[PDB]
Amino acid sequence: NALLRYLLDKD
Amino acid sequence: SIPHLILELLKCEPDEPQVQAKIMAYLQQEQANRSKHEKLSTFGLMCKMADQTLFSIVEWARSSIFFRELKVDDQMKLLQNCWSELLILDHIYRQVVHGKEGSIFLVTGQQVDYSIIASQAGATLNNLMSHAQELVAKLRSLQFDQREFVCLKFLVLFSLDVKNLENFQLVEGVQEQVNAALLDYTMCNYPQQTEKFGQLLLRLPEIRAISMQAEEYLYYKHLNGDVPYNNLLIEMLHA
Ligand SMILES: C[C@H](CCC(=O)NCCC[N+](C)(C)CCCS(=O)(=O)[O-])[C@H]1CC[C@H]2[C@H]3[C@H](O)C[C@@H]4C[C@H](O)CC[C@]4(C)[C@H]3C[C@H](O)[C@]12C
């Protein structure tokens, strides 16, 4: 689930 | 009065007028940035609003006590395990606090007449919203408050059934301590409702039932080719 990882990691 | 632990959970509550304004602005600009040739359908806008709602849930979780201590892999596992339940719980509590008879209060801070959205929604989604409204009414009758809400949210998030977590100890701890605090809180603040603690917990299976209905609805839209690619809700479903 790439989008979820992104939301949790961005910033 | 109030357990320290619950106060700490409450400090992590989202800034609701800010979230409402942010999502509203996003949905407005999205329509705006589209030419007449490419305007989004009703379902299309429902999907975008739902995505934004889940983005805000993830944002909330990421900055929250306890959750923020977890590695991203563990954070994904917890959220993957409860995303639809958090969406439903968020919606239900929004109606408990802000709902008016005959209306639905949206994440954007707007009231919409129920008959209007139900006309567009059709049978399946109308059934889901109706089920959710019965839970809203039940929670109101129980005098559900925000302290109890945040406890339930953390119990949903830090679920025992999560698979292959590295830091399962946090789940164990949060479960033990939040259940204890919720009990202490309800006994202290609602002494006249001797069974309130158990009555609140019994709503969690009901929330899960509604979340299954939601996932079903989403899946059938996806089977029909109606859900845009990389919609987060469908990405969560794809697992
Ligand atoms: C069985 C399907 C999954 C199908 C699948 O695995 N799709 C992968 C690609 C498909 N392939 C191309 C590989 C094969 C062709 C299938 S094709 O769909 O293209 O004909 C999945 C997707 C959504 C699932 C549930 C929902 O969550 C809601 C609810 C949760 C409850 O807890 C249990 C009940 C219920 C209704 C669930 C049942 C079932 O579990 C579901 C239908």
Side-chain angles (χ1 to χ4, degrees), chain A, chain B residues 1-33 35 37-239:
Chain A
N1 192 344
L3 184 54
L4 181 59
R5 188 177 300 276
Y6 174 57
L7 296 176
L8 288 164
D9 185 56
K10 72 183 177 57
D11 324 330
Chain B
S1 34
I2 190 173
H4 175 87
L5 177 60
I6 299 185
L7 206 50
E8 291 297 311
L9 303 182
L10 288 162
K11 287 174 187 176
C12 301
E13 286 288 81
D15 179 350
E16 192 167 67
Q18 184 171 357
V19 171
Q20 287 172 357
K22 188 171 202 291
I23 295 180
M24 180 179 274
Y26 171 88
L27 296 164
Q28 290 173 327
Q29 205 74 7
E30 272 286 315
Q31 285 267 66
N33 290 340
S35 65
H37 304 99
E38 304 185 22
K39 293 300 198 208
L40 283 104
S41 70
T42 295
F43 188 65
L45 288 153
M46 286 169 171
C47 283
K48 286 201 173 285
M49 183 171 74
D51 261 10
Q52 288 300 309
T53 300
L54 191 54
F55 292 177
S56 290
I57 289 168
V58 172
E59 201 156 351
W60 162 76
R62 179 184 166 166
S63 287
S64 165
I65 187 174
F66 306 131
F67 193 87
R68 61 191 175 220
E69 308 177 35
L70 290 171
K71 268 29 172 176
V72 174
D73 286 325
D74 275 356
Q75 298 178 326
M76 290 171 67
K77 287 180 173 61
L78 287 184
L79 283 162
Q80 187 67 57
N81 188 62
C82 71
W83 64 278
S84 49
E85 285 162 88
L86 293 180
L87 277 166
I88 297 303
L89 176 54
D90 173 76
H91 165 75
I92 284 167
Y93 189 66
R94 182 171 302 113
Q95 305 320 302
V96 168
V97 176
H98 299 294
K100 316 272 168 142
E101 192 178 345
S103 191
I104 299 284
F105 190 85
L106 299 177
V107 74
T108 51
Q110 326 162 291
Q111 297 272 193
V112 178
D113 179 90
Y114 184 82
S115 70
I116 299 303
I117 184 166
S119 289
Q120 289 154 325
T124 297
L125 189 46
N126 182 50
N127 286 336
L128 185 169
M129 293 183 295
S130 177
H131 197 169
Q133 171 48 36
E134 289 182 15
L135 203 46
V136 172
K138 176 58 167 167
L139 289 163
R140 282 187 168 181
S141 80
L142 284 173
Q143 293 209 309
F144 192 43
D145 74 25
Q146 187 180 19
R147 277 67 61 188
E148 299 154 354
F149 167 70
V150 295
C151 287
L152 292 189
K153 194 157 60 153
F154 278 79
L155 293 182
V156 164
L157 181 53
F158 287 87
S159 186
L160 294 167
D161 61 351
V162 65
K163 264 152 172 24
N164 294 320
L165 211 65
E166 294 183 48
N167 189 0
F168 196 75
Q169 290 92 344
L170 189 56
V171 166
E172 302 174 345
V174 169
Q175 279 286 333
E176 185 157 2
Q177 297 303 317
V178 172
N179 276 281
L182 180 56
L183 182 58
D184 286 343
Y185 177 81
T186 56
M187 286 182 68
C188 176
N189 289 268
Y190 295 93
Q192 84 289 355
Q193 289 176 251
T194 60
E195 305 300 312
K196 190 180 182 179
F197 174 78
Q199 289 171 333
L200 296 171
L201 300 182
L202 287 174
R203 270 4 92 200
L204 294 179
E206 295 178 350
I207 292 266
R208 185 180 57 252
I210 297 166
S211 84
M212 297 177 178
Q213 283 181 258
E215 287 178 16
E216 187 188 63
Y217 171 80
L218 182 66
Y219 181 60
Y220 281 63
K221 298 298 277 190
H222 165 75
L223 287 177
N224 260 306
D226 291 334
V227 181
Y229 208 82
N230 288 324
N231 168 272
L232 177 60
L233 280 67
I234 204 75
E235 286 300 293
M236 302 304 303
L237 190 65
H238 286 151

